Design a protein around this ligand. Structure first.
Ligand SMILES: CC(C)=CCC/C(C)=C/CC/C(C)=C\CC/C(C)=C/CC/C(C)=C/CC/C(C)=C/CC/C(C)=C/CC/C(C)=C/CC/C(C)=C/CC1=C(C)C(=O)c2ccccc2C1=O
Ligand SMILES: CC(C)=CCC/C(C)=C/CC/C(C)=C\CC/C(C)=C/CC/C(C)=C/CC/C(C)=C/CC/C(C)=C\CC/C(C)=C/CC/C(C)=C/CC1=C(C)C(=O)c2ccccc2C1=O
Ligand SMILES: CCCCCCCCCCCCCCCC(=O)O[C@H](COC(=O)CCCCCCC[C@@H](C)CCCCCCCCC)COP(=O)(O)O[C@H]1[C@H](O)[C@H](O)[C@H](O)[C@@H](O)[C@@H]1O
Ligand SMILES: CCCCCCCCCCCCCCCC(=O)O[C@H](COC(=O)CCCCCCC[C@@H](C)CCCCCCCCC)COP(=O)(O)O[C@H]1[C@H](O)[C@H](O)[C@H](O)[C@@H](O)[C@@H]1O
Ligand code: HEC
Ligand code: FES
Lengths: 223, 216, 105, 216
């Protein structure tokens, strides 16, 4: 719909053209180019909230979303009409598909998440550190369509795991893993983060060892 | 103590009747459909065989025509040991798929397996040269078996699933398909060229075997 | 590598034709202490390792930008096969894993 | 210290020349002979293909005739995209295997691929009906490919390795093999029956493709 493209243009003019130049270009050393990134890229970068941003820093972090689903389709179709690239997967309603993306396998998703990317984040999808200030974020507060469009067009410092690098079966399979690894409870106690031994150490000292020394000073006297 | 379940010699058993082994509902999580292919059209599969029936209802041969990679692969194998005669047989695709014992679509004498609405099962706009109705020979040697595997790209799976289903037939003679040279031969009316009946289908006898290609 | 950033690349010795256009093949096992350096940062082009957080420059050749590593992480040569498939154009020129005594001569 | 083997930017490399990968002498503990079979005779294998050559030395088709289970399987596939013409082609086994550009065994005009010592490569005591010399059709559609896989049990691997090697040929026309009915047709001499040249081989044009079956 052309009125939807116009709505995307009206939201485009009054949020970003200080850093995208209003011809969908890149304002040099203030905000990069934007054509070719596409509706999938704009869905992940505004549906998470990140790109209607406020400073150019180590990496632009997560935030509350600056537009809603009635307007992300407008903004992403506007950037795809000006440019053109990956598109967000949509179900039989025309809306953004978020539940039909969980694939039928998890163990293949476990091995593929673990090989291809869990170097950067974590095993269950907690965050991980990156080089100069930038960091991987947690995958717990991640809409499955945002996970698919996160790996589909890689925003900041992550490789864009393309439609041909990972097949959509594999990408549905990875988002089946992470929406049932950051959602399944920690089997057998409190989950001290997701990454193991450093929270287990710090919760050995102040929970276990401080209680042990407190028992040891209640039992023995002092002199 | 002695165990209770022993020591009883009756008449020493019937011989065990031959193991007619039942099929396997361990594999049965799957239903064999018509097949899997592309064919961005009304819709078809990639495997549809045929059973060539004679004038007594018995099987004579077995055809398998299917579109695989834009080329209609047709493999005609034998079914009976003593069905065909000692000679070459001419395969021909008929437009109507009725393998009746005595039927005729037009006004005329109903021959064996002549239920077609004409001769060769050509295209809907083709009436001339050797189209998909005419086929290669499946010759029968002294062993009594005629096998012919060919790839005709004239038709496909979207052309065999028409409003009237087609068939594959084999007569008692070979496949000529207007093989009369006009430089030495002659006609009964003195014409140099061939007849229109020899141009529609090959010069053979009556159709002995015929089978509908609608997954027969 | 994004082909807007192919003028930032400076290859090293015996290794100038180990690209394939813009396809580079650097090993995953890092320079020292052999963990897979499977962290990779586009738009800064740094192969970061997780085990001791040692960056490597993806642009020039995997020289350590920063970290506890001091050696270039090894690069694999690339060509395409007949039928157009990515193949290795031989072996690594250096031993690929972590360092030890018998090396570098 | 800094490691010694780094930091040298020459001109940034030629693009790597296409990987013409060498074959594999890891598998090479094995020599591919003519084949393995039974054939309790002078001795033959189970695989012997053919390369159909034209009048310019170029390949047109490719035959593969071999004895497997007492039935001579012959598969004739295409080699070139635009070799054959748009029509049916008649395969015929020739007695002599010379695929010469212009040769004639008897006293006469040397036609294309006519180096045979007669017509059909029949048995050593056979001269009549459709023996192993005559073959089925390998028709060429508009795509320009003629494929025909048949099983003729008239000859075997012990009959193709004779004193003179045989060949497989295809003319510019189809395969007739005396397909003239004597009830409506007529000859130039008024005879009801067919000619002896049409009884030896089929009625076609000049032989376009020909290939020796001695593992060509
Ligand atoms: C840098 C160096 C190496 C030290 C790092 C400390 C860093 C400089 C502190 C942040 C900056 C700032 C707050 C400094 C202010 C100075 C001062 C006035 C305030 C100090 C009070 C604060 C900082 C004490 C916090 C303790 C902190 C320093 C160490 C925590 C120990 C480890 C890392 C915690 C383990 C841990 C546990 C136990 C979890 O349950 C958990 C659950 C889910 C995710 C993760 C974790 C997790 O990492
Ligand atoms: C006593 C001292 C070690 C002298 C030895 C002689 C010395 C000259 C030998 C040479 C050592 C020098 C050259 C290098 C240092 C290397 C070091 C000593 C390795 C050896 C291992 C071992 C001996 C370590 C020292 C002993 C250890 C630190 C004593 C614990 C600290 C105190 C005194 C105990 C009470 C603390 C208890 C009440 C809990 C309080 C909570 C605080 C926040 C705990 C601090 C804390 C600790 C200590 C963690 O290990 C830790 C690990 C992972 C996550 C978090 C934490 C964490 O928060
Ligand atoms: C009594 C009857 C017996 C009942 C059993 C009691 C034992 C507990 C186990 C029972 C199941 C509960 C575990 C739940 C399952 C679980 O793992 O616990 C998560 C961890 O989350 C959090 O931290 C938030 C929790 C905050 C609560 C308070 C924190 C605990 C403190 C006290 C620990 C002390 C550590 C030492 C401090 C160091 C001192 C420093 C000076 C919380 O899950 P949730 O909040 O819903 O979502 C996750 C996201 O947190 C997560 O970021 C996301 O990534 C996903 O994991 C998502 O699932
Ligand atoms: C009982 C005493 C306690 C010592 C225990 C271990 C010693 C065992 C010695 C037995 C073997 C002796 C030489 C024959 C074994 C042999 O030939 O190899 C040597 C393998 O010995 C080694 O592991 C370690 C020593 C290497 C030789 C010299 C080391 C000592 C001196 C040279 C270092 C002190 C002075 C320098 C600085 C000192 C410190 C700072 C100042 C050197 O490796 P490499 O040189 O890399 O040669 C490769 C071929 O292996 C492979 O086939 C082939 O592919 C080649 O391409 C190559 O890779
Ligand atoms: C450095 C290597 C890197 C790897 C590889 C990588 N990530 Fe990312 N990921 C990041 C960074 C950095 C961000 C944040 C980008 C931003 O904030 O604009 C991110 C963002 C995300 C988010 C958004 C989190 C949120 O709160 O919305 C998700 C989900 C995610 N990645 C999952 C994945 C998936 C899925 C893969 C592919 C299987 C992957 N990561 C691979 C580093 C990486
Ligand atoms: S382990 Fe990766 S560099 Fe030390």
């Amino acid at each position: 719909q052309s009125a939807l493209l116009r709505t995307g243009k009206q939201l485009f003019e009054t949020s970003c053209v200080s850093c995208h130049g209003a011809n969908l270009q890149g304002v040099p050393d203030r905000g990069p180019s934007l054509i070719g990134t596409g509706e999938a890229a704009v869905y992940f970068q505004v549906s998470t909230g990140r790109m209607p941003a406020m400073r150019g820093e180590a990496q632009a972090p997560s935030k509350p979303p600056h537009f809603d689903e009635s307007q992300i389709d407008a903004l992403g179709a506007y950037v795809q009409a000006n440019g053109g690239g990956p598109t967000v997967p949509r179900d039989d309603h025309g809306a953004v598909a978020q539940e039909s993306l969980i694939g039928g396998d998890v163990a293949r998703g476990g091995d593929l998440f673990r090989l291809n990317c869990a170097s950067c984040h974590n095993f269950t999808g907690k965050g991980g550190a990156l080089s100069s200030g930038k960091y991987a974020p947690d995958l717990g507060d991640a809409n499955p369509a945002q996970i698919y469009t996160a790996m589909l067009t890689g925003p900041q410092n992550m490789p864009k795991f393309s439609d041909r690098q990972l097949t959509p079966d594999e990408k549905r399979d990875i988002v089946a893993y992470v929406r049932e690894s950051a959602e399944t409870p920690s089997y057998g106690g409190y989950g001290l983060g997701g990454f193991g031994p450093a929270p287990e150490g710090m919760a050995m000292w102040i929970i276990g060892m401080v209680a042990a020394i407190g028992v040891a000073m209640w039992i023995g006297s002092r002199a | 103590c002695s165990p209770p379940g022993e020591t009883a010699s009756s008449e020493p058993g019937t011989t065990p009747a031959i193991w007619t082994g039942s099929p396997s509902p361990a594999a049965p999580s799957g239903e064999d459909h018509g097949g899997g292919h592309g064919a961005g059209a009304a819709g078809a599969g990639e495997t549809l065989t045929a059973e060539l029936k004679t004038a007594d209802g018995t099987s004579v041969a077995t055809a398998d025509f299917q579109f695989a990679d834009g080329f209609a692969t047709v493999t005609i194998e034998t079914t009976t040991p003593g069905r065909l005669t000692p000679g070459f047989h001419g395969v021909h695709i008929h437009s109507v798929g009725k393998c009746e014992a005595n039927s005729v679509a037009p006004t005329g004498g109903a021959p064996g397996d002549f239920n077609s609405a004409g001769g060769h099962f050509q295209v809907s706009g083709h009436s001339g040269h050797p189209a998909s109705g005419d086929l290669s020979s499946l010759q029968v040697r002294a062993d009594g078996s005629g096998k012919l595997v060919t790839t005709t790209d004239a038709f496909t799976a979207e052309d065999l699933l028409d409003g009237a289903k087609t068939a594959i037939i084999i007569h008692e003679k070979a496949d000529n398909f207007a093989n009369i040279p006009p430089e030495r031969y002659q006609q009964v009316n003195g014409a140099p060229g061939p007849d229109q009946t020899t141009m529609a289908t090959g010069d053979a006898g009556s159709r002995v075997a015929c089978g509908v290609i609608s997954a027969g | 590598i994004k082909p807007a950033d192919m003028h930032r690349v400076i290859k090293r010795k015996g290794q100038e034709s180990f690209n394939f256009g813009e396809l580079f093949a650097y090993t995953k096992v890092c320079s020292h202490l052999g963990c897979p350096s499977s962290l990779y940062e586009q738009q800064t082009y740094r192969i970061l390792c997780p085990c001791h957080q040692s960056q490597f420059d993806a642009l020039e050749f995997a020289k350590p930008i920063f970290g506890p590593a001091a050696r270039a992480l090894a690069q694999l040569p690339i060509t395409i096969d007949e039928d157009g498939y990515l193949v290795a154009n031989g072996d690594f020129v250096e031993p690929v894993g972590p360092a030890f005594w018998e090396r570098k001569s």
